[PDB]
Design a protein around this ligand. Sequence first.
Ligand SMILES: O=C(O)C1=C[C@@H](O)[C@@H](O)[C@H](O)C1
Length: 263
Amino acid sequence: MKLKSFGVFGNPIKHSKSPLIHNACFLTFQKELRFLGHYHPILLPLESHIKSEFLHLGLSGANVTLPFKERAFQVCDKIKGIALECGAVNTLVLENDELVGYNTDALGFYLSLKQKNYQNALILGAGGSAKALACELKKQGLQVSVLNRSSRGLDFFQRLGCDCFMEPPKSAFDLIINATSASLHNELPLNKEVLKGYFKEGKLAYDLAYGFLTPFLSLAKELKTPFQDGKDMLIYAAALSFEKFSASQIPYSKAFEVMRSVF
Ligand SMILES: O=C(O)C1=C[C@@H](O)[C@@H](O)[C@H](O)C1
């Protein structure tokens, strides 16, 4: 049986549930794929440029998580699909010996939303996850505000047409999104009274972290604001990545069904 190797690059990487869900798919779909994939967690040094490792490990494809998604966009040979406008890559595939970058966070976030009744959004964060979410939400015709602590990174969000803040804007937002970078989200991302204000006027508190209740979500829950963690995004984005790992042979809906079941 033909073997191919995949993994997910991050630091930290111990928490990632990508190997669980991708391995479940590779084991089921080996029938149709006519190879058996195995998918590994891969801890990289902070300074890594990724490509050397990808090639040394003989990977066919990989995912990229914190804090490497912007670096992946820089180091891949070719960027395809909506990643062209995300400034960030979360999926790498070796295609004809070119390292090709995609971004499945954008659509995976969109698919994860139950309602499309949302008109505007405040994204907390400025890393690869925030960039893909801003791209996607602007594409869907929401107004997007982005709140962070420095002037670095602002050109991307301003070129998208986002309203960029470093002090929390006195406005109501339908979606309030914790996409803070290089963070595990164990800590409130804003002053608690400020977040309470947003939650009381907001329609959904959405936190990209998955696999525990963050204090951000717990505050929304206490306030009876509807809230959503990162599980359904992870699973849709992973299923989309799996579609790419299959050379578009297995549709994401079929990967999704397997992944959700095992998760
Ligand atoms: O936790 C994980 O395994 C992942 C989380 C998201 O950042 C993804 O975009 C990434 O591809 C994988």
